[model samples]
Target: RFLKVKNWETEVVLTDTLHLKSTLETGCTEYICMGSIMHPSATKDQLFPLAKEFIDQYYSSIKRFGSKAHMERLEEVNKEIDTTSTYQLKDTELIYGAKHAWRNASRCVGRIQWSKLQVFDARDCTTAHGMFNYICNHVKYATNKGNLRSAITIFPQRTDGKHDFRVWNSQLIRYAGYKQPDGSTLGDPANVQFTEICIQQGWKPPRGRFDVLPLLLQANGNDPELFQIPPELVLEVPIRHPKFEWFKDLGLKWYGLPAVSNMLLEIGGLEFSACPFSGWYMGTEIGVRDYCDNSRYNILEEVAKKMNLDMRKTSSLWKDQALVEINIAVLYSFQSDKVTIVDHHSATESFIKHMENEYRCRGGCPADWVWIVPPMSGSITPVFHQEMLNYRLTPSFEYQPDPWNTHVW
Candidate 1:
């Protein structure tokens, strides 16, 4: 069982955001076979084989494996790659690829709704201007006046490892962080570096704590440009506590959409570098992780003080009260406004039921318990007790290098 069952090597793959992990990065040329992804190195030699494997699996999923339908599809890709060294996914192919990637995302807890996503293909996108237009439409459609449809928009695939199109923002929507003179951050600390870059690109820096960051998009190796997302398209919820009427005085809110950008979508051997996706948020993610992280707002003590919990001693377990109520506040606020949210308890419980479905359906439910477990109530969540195997699968959402840092430009 030590063959592919080596836990140490596979564990890092869960948190990893790149092509290779530590052990795999060793340049030993013996070709220690890894079972996750297959890359054809932007060339023709291995391209068809990778495509063939993926297409074979695709056809099998449809119960058409080895049928003429499968053979003709393979034939078309073979012909397409012979001339251009790249091929296109049909609308059906694109749709499934998007869905499958979400399915294979081992870290996502709320993947039980994988099939519910609206996949929009922007494969014809040729300019940053066009990319912004498509993204806004995605925003508008996905927002749906706060009914919140899960969705994604795929930009054109990476073409021959050049003219690569990508969205530079880590996520389609984020708050702007301004650096103050005394070395304090004014907004989300995570956005300070990205915000600085956007400012230098001629965005008039806004002084508000949560001014939505403008999108910076690049297409076909062109100069990246910034565009403000149309305000009406972004649905946001103001946080309030059901019990503590004072919670509203905190004056905090978050965007309703968690559409992630700057990630790669690998279907077969093909890579789409700038695909943005969203789902209804798990409330604790905002309430706890974003709110309580030390480097983030670090609002735990403030909330505890507001609750009149004993800050003098650890005996009162003061922090725990703040954490519990913050999660409750987030859950209560989203539901009150009808903006769609899942509590960590119900979300994690639901995820456990899906795992058995996945275990039988695909026999490949790769997961990271570190992530699958809710940040605050780890021990109580079922995922914390359930052991899982974490492995890489394709099609998958992969971390892409920051656009400003990569030489691919």
Candidate 2:
């Protein structure tokens, strides 16, 4: 029987050189990759396979049940664009057309990437840097469960690239669904391009300033905490818009099953990136190497600026490796388990210890999978069938904005 690993509660662990070097001391062998990192802390050889494995498993499961509409949409956008006729299309026009659709698909799926929104808080040192660090620290405080979390295994590769996976996003969207008869696109004659139509209808709509994730205007570690997780404040967009009636059965907005894991990247501060829909945001740092290239390269400096961390600025005692030691917490429940929220701590510690002890594995990293099982009472977030959403808005064939605004009938 195929072993199906069900929902696992998750938190991200950060490891620096000291932690990585600890493998020999602790007898730890492997580690898992949870999310993003600010710097090229871990070498690419060390990281890619973990990331690739995660990506593969993720898409495989989505394919297991049926189609992956998100990926299909990505494929449709680029399927033949590189071919003579379309590539023959003016480069600028093609770029615009492709970029336009890419953004559209990203919004449609409520795709979240932290680095997409990073901005310098100061001119290599600015007030905004302080504010940003404050937020990152808040996120850290929210997810840290006492002692450090898990161990991480490094693949034999290394690089300075931020795995935006923008290509992946665009590719998957274009390839998600049924292809056109002429093989020109991913939609039908009437609703031939749902991606474009959705942009015209929802993407460009007037949205609240914050993009809807209930970000508290407080710093991390502050006693007056705004870190309380309200069950209702999770979804990024309202679900039942009369305009987007078709979206109802397709499940809540992709943004809502919002899963912020206990994985901290190097950025800190209240000023992360924001996009369409108000309330949600991401933690990002663009052009890191270019920015930090020739400087003294202080990790603590960057962290303090990003998190608005008010540490006594002594001679910079941080390294690139230290910067990669940023922490993160995963905030998500099982898709089906509603009552059982997973606030994982012990499991995280055990996993980290394993990675810490066995650091010198020749090739195979010494870590197993990690998960946080939700309490029994909770349920998985609903996976509403797209067919259902499609059926609801068949006549107008429009995803009414009203029905999708609030989930209730």
Local distance difference test, each candidate: 0.82, 0.23
Residue-level error in angstroms, candidate 2, position 118: 6.5
lDDT of 2: 0.23
Tell me the TM-score of model 2: 0.18
Cα shift from native, residue 342, model 1 (Å): 0.1
lDDT of 2 by residue, 221-253 (tens): 221112223434333332232332332332322
RMSD of each: 5.7, 24.7
What is candidate 1's TM-score against the reference?
A: 0.89
Per-prediction TM-score, please? 0.89, 0.18
lDDT of 2 at 257: 25
